[PDB]
Symmetry: C2
Subunit: 202 residues, 2 copies
């Protein structure tokens, strides 16, 4: 069931929290036994429904963050911003960001909570990926919209984010670019990526 997945990702996350606890060595012994035993039960559990933990745990982190978001219960309500609140980068005039387009030979992939879209018949062109996104430090958190543009400015490709669990990470976006490019290049084409991206991306 889907409640099984969710439940798993939660437990995974709460467990991560507890490790953090016992990292401060706050935990007494029987606790730390719950920690070990629940880590084993978890490895088994995730083995069997065949989700790896790392991402199950980010999912859980999002579910729980949502719970801690809704209360009210006075204060059980928490306030957290560990946030180096972030800077926004726009390679795309909105004129471009909103522009008609389609695919003659449509190719659609989903990876790491991003939709990658590509036109299969586009050959021997020179394209540049432009991306509006957000930065913390020099390393990306998040993407708003990526589009691929020909010499004559035209959409042959797109990478857009998805409301699934977990969300997408700088990584998910890096491989995403890799896939969009690499497939573009496969039917001959040359993909330059914008400086911003170059400067940030990978």
């Amino acid at each position: 069931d889907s409640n099984t997945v969710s439940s798993f990702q939660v437990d995974c996350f709460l467990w991560h929290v507890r490790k953090r606890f016992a990292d401060q060595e706050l935990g007494d012994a029987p606790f730390l036994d719950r920690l070990r035993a629940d880590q084993a039960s978890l490895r088994g559990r995730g083995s069997t429904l065949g989700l790896d933990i790392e991402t199950a745990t980010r999912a859980g982190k999002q579910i729980v963050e949502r719970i801690l978001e809704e209360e009210s219960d006075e204060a059980l309500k928490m306030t957290i911003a560990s946030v180096p609140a972030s800077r926004y980068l726009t390679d795309m005039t909105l004129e471009e960001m909103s522009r008609d387009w389609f695919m003659l030979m449509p190719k659609q992939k989903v990876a790491g909570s991003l939709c990658i879209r590509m036109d299969q018949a586009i050959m021997d062109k020179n394209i540049i990926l432009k991306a509006n996104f957000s930065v913390i430090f020099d390393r990306l958190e998040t993407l708003i919209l990526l589009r691929a543009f020909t010499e004559e400015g035209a959409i042959v490709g797109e990478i857009s984010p998805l409301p699934s669990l977990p969300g997408h990470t700088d990584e998910d976006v890096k491989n995403a670019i890799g896939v969009l490019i690499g497939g573009l290049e496969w039917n001959d084409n040359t993909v330059r990526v914008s400086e911003t991206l170059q400067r940030f991306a990978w």
Copy 2:
């Protein structure tokens, strides 16, 4: 041990979170069995070291909030403000807020993570509690400093907050006022509380 208390308050809180989960009915069955069984283990546990749960759970909420505060792990970092970010009320010129004072017959109590201080020999005076604090809605979250002032402006009493677990709540502050007053009145005295307080307090 103190790690035993902490561990208990955590588990209490994480458990509250899970109930929230299964409130959305996300939970699958074996989960919900962990929920019931862990609720029993918890009632037993807190019975024995003799802490009631409600407050153990607010404590846990503070400990955990602290954990979720520190990562970094990229994003496992959460951002939460459910906050109707709040309005501040000051009955006390800082000239008053910082003013010498002592107690001839000192009386010191601690309740709900607040220190209550009172001068035992103060008789047949007319005093007003002034308080600088903070409001969400018409109901107080939090107190910054309460002081009790005679006709001739003088400190006969104080209620100040403490960095313990859990922190203090509007309630803790309401009973706190009750105790300061009621003890002031016991050796004859008349305690008017400021409008702000009246308007907010209780």
